[PDB]
Motif scaffolding. Structure first.
Motif, short mmCIF file in Angstrom:
data_model
loop_
_atom_site.label_atom_id
_atom_site.label_comp_id
_atom_site.label_asym_id
_atom_site.label_seq_id
_atom_site.Cartn_x
_atom_site.Cartn_y
_atom_site.Cartn_z
N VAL A 161 31.32 24.49 26.53
CA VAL A 161 31.30 24.99 27.90
C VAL A 161 30.86 26.45 27.95
O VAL A 161 30.23 26.88 28.92
CB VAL A 161 32.68 24.78 28.57
N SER A 162 31.16 27.23 26.91
CA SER A 162 30.75 28.63 26.92
C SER A 162 29.24 28.78 26.87
O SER A 162 28.66 29.60 27.59
CB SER A 162 31.40 29.38 25.76
N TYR A 163 28.57 27.97 26.05
CA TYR A 163 27.13 28.09 25.85
C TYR A 163 26.33 27.08 26.65
O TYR A 163 25.10 27.10 26.57
CB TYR A 163 26.81 27.96 24.36
N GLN A 164 26.99 26.21 27.41
CA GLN A 164 26.33 25.22 28.26
C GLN A 164 25.35 24.36 27.47
O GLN A 164 24.26 24.03 27.94
CB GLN A 164 25.64 25.89 29.45
N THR A 165 25.75 23.96 26.26
CA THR A 165 24.88 23.23 25.35
C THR A 165 25.63 22.04 24.75
O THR A 165 26.86 22.06 24.65
CB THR A 165 24.34 24.15 24.25
N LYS A 166 24.88 21.01 24.36
CA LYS A 166 25.44 19.77 23.84
C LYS A 166 24.99 19.59 22.39
O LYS A 166 23.79 19.55 22.12
CB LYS A 166 25.00 18.58 24.69
#
Length: 148
Positions: free
Chosen positions: A76-81
């Motif tokens: 959630v911090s880096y908005q990446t999967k």
């Protein structure tokens, strides 16, 4: 105490992998949330994360099938999967020779390991070919986490 979850596939939700917390031997407690089919962790820390799927098909067709199972982390911090754990299975080597009767095949996949997660991280356990899942017996398809 420990954030914990053990959710199981909905045997009625054909063609999808819909997790349920609301069954005789499922669990979802201590801050873990099941939201939009993802497990949400409540705090920074180490977590053991694991999942099993079971695939079933009838015979071996002309198109070579590859089955995949992946646990991924939406940070959630880096908005990446990012993929944490993944595996691939081929149920067939060659086509069912014509004239010979197709037999049911079964392929399980298990994934599990320990990962550092951040509060609000979203965990998904997904497959490429959901209809191939087999829900016929309880205990066959599940997804869980344990805070350590």
């Amino acid at each position: 105490d420990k954030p914990v979850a053990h959710v199981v596939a909905n045997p009625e939700a054909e063609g999808q992998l819909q997790w349920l917390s609301r069954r005789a031997n499922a669990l979802l407690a201590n801050g873990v949330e099941l939201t939009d089919n993802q497990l949400i962790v409540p705090s920074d820390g180490l977590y053991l994360i694991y999942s099993q799927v079971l695939f079933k098909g009838q015979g071996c067709p002309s198109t070579h099938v590859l089955l995949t199972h992946t646990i991924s982390r939406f940070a959630v911090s880096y908005q990446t999967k990012v993929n944490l754990l993944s595996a691939i299975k081929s149920p067939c080597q060659r086509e069912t020779p014509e004239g010979t009767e197709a037999k049911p095949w079964y392929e399980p996949i298990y994934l599990g390991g320990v990962f550092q997660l951040e509060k609000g991280d979203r965990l998904s356990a997904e497959i490429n070919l959901p209809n191939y899942l087999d829900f016929a017996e309880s205990g066959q398809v599940y997804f869980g986490i344990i805070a350590l």
